Design an enzyme around this catalytic site. Structure first.
Site, short mmCIF file in Angstrom:
data_model
loop_
_atom_site.label_atom_id
_atom_site.label_comp_id
_atom_site.label_asym_id
_atom_site.label_seq_id
_atom_site.Cartn_x
_atom_site.Cartn_y
_atom_site.Cartn_z
CG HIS A 56 -0.58 0.53 2.44
ND1 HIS A 56 -0.20 -0.27 3.46
CD2 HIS A 56 -0.43 1.84 2.91
CE1 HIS A 56 0.17 0.48 4.51
NE2 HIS A 56 0.03 1.77 4.17
CG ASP B 128 0.02 -3.69 3.18
OD1 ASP B 128 0.46 -3.23 2.11
OD2 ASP B 128 -0.17 -2.97 4.19
CB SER C 162 2.62 2.31 6.30
OG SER C 162 1.45 2.66 7.05
N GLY C 163 5.05 0.04 6.16
CA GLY C 163 6.15 -0.52 5.38
C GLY C 163 7.42 -0.81 6.18
C1 987 Z 1 -8.50 0.87 9.22
C2 987 Z 1 -7.39 1.39 8.31
C3 987 Z 1 -7.86 1.47 6.86
O1 987 Z 1 -8.26 2.53 6.41
N1 987 Z 1 -7.85 0.34 6.12
C4 987 Z 1 -7.40 -0.98 6.56
C5 987 Z 1 -8.52 -2.00 6.46
C6 987 Z 1 -9.06 -2.07 5.03
C7 987 Z 1 -9.42 -0.69 4.50
N2 987 Z 1 -9.70 -0.74 3.06
C8 987 Z 1 -8.30 0.33 4.73
N3 987 Z 1 -6.87 2.70 8.75
C9 987 Z 1 -7.72 3.78 9.28
C10 987 Z 1 -6.84 5.02 9.12
C11 987 Z 1 -5.44 4.42 9.36
N4 987 Z 1 -4.30 5.21 8.88
S1 987 Z 1 -3.09 5.67 9.87
O2 987 Z 1 -2.23 6.50 9.08
O3 987 Z 1 -3.69 6.21 11.05
C12 987 Z 1 -2.20 4.22 10.34
C13 987 Z 1 -1.45 3.55 9.37
C14 987 Z 1 -0.76 2.42 9.71
C15 987 Z 1 -0.80 1.91 11.03
C16 987 Z 1 -0.09 0.73 11.40
C17 987 Z 1 -0.16 0.30 12.69
CL1 987 Z 1 0.69 -1.17 13.12
C18 987 Z 1 -0.91 0.96 13.66
C19 987 Z 1 -1.60 2.08 13.33
C20 987 Z 1 -1.57 2.59 12.01
C21 987 Z 1 -2.27 3.77 11.63
C22 987 Z 1 -5.56 3.02 8.77
O4 987 Z 1 -4.64 2.31 8.39
#
Ligand code: 987
Ligand code: CA
Ligand code: MG
Lengths: 234, 53
Positions: free
Chosen positions: A42, A88, A185-186
């Site tokens: 992603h 991912d 992420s990553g």
């Molecule tokens: C549920 C998921 C989302 O929107 N998704 C995932 C499920 C499927 C959906 N199509 C997309 N989400 C909601 C927003 C969030 N983005 S973030 O930048 O706050 C983020 C990114 C990576 C993270 C990794 C860890 Cl280990 C912990 C917290 C993190 C927060 C995020 O990733």
């Protein structure tokens, strides 16, 4: 990273940073060898042209140990889906080989069976990155690390509003204010065994950062060990 | 607890049970020592080690 602490000199040498056209970090990676970086699928849609920076701990100034590498080949898992975030995972081949030095060294790839019985049954793993220090804040100019408990699979399933597949695992805290966040992420999730660190996960997603009743979701590296090996040869 | 289940079979890294006996091995870039248990870095900057210089 929310909570945790700074990576001190030489403590997080496998960390990589994907940087956009403006030389700003948007995602992390793990150094696997002189030519290969491990990252999240992603992260590839978060910028058009990107490069990889290694050896950096403070993005405010260039002290001299930093090095930038261009990407020759992007190897994205053909099963990644934006809808569930299943599969991912991506591997990057660099144009020039990384020079290992202070703050620049690869993390070890474990064997599947042993990793599952011995590493993933440990109390904790370590997550690291240049991401946000709070859900609504700006990205960290300092590289940070955080110890995160492995979380029972059933408990994680009950807590999540999105499907937790077999290609994913959970780590972190129920209520305590410590988690990975946006920009991480990553990046690496590693597990220590007798002073040696093995890659066990890839920072993937979370319902916000460090929320109550919510955990961090990581790509399970053990499910993709053969795929990784094959990607590092072809 | 027996073999690989008892303190990782005394291995530094990977442990396997082959025909009811412990067999140790190491990650790429390490070699197994003469005792068949310890893992020895073959060169500089072996994987999984925090850097000291
Ligand atoms: C549920 C998921 C989302 O929107 N998704 C995932 C499920 C499927 C959906 N199509 C997309 N989400 C909601 C927003 C969030 N983005 S973030 O930048 O706050 C983020 C990114 C990576 C993270 C990794 C860890 Cl280990 C912990 C917290 C993190 C927060 C995020 O990733
Ligand atoms: Ca710097
Ligand atoms: Mg929580």
């Amino acid at each position: 990273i929310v909570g945790g602490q700074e990576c001190k000199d030489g403590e997080c040498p496998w960390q990589a940073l994907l940087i956009n056209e403006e030389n700003e970090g948007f995602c992390g990676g793990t150094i696997l060898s002189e030519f290969y970086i491990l990252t999240a699928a992603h992260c590839l849609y978060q910028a058009k042209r990107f490069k990889v920076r290694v050896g950096d701990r403070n993005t405010e100034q260039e002290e001299g140990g930093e090095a930038v590498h261009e990407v020759e080949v992007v190897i994205k898992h053909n099963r990644f889906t934006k809808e569930t975030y299943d599969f991912d995972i991506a591997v990057l081949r660099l144009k020039t080989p990384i020079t290992f030095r202070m703050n620049v060294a690869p993390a070890c790839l474990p064997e599947r069976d042993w990793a599952e019985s011995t590493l993933m049954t440990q109390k904790t793993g370590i997550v690291s990155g240049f991401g946000r220090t709070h859900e609504k804040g700006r990205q960290s100019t300092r590289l940070k690390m955080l110890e995160v408990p492995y979380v029972d699979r059933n408990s994680c399933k009950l807590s999540s509003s999105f499907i937790i597949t077999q290609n994913m695992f959970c780590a972190g805290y129920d209520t305590k204010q410590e988690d990975a966040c946006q920009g991480d992420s990553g990046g690496p999730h590693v597990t220590r065994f007798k002073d040696t660190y093995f890659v066990t996960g890839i920072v993937s997603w979370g319902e916000g950062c460090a929320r109550k009743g919510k955990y961090g979701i990581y790509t399970k590296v053990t499910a993709f060990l053969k795929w990784i090996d094959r990607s590092m040869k072809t | 607890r027996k073999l690989c289940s008892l303190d990782n079979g005394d291995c530094d890294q990977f442990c396997h049970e082959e025909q009811n006996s412990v067999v140790c091995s190491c990650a790429r870039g390490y070699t197994l020592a003469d005792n068949g248990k310890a893992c020895i870095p073959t060169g500089p900057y072996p994987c999984g080690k925090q850097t000291l210089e």
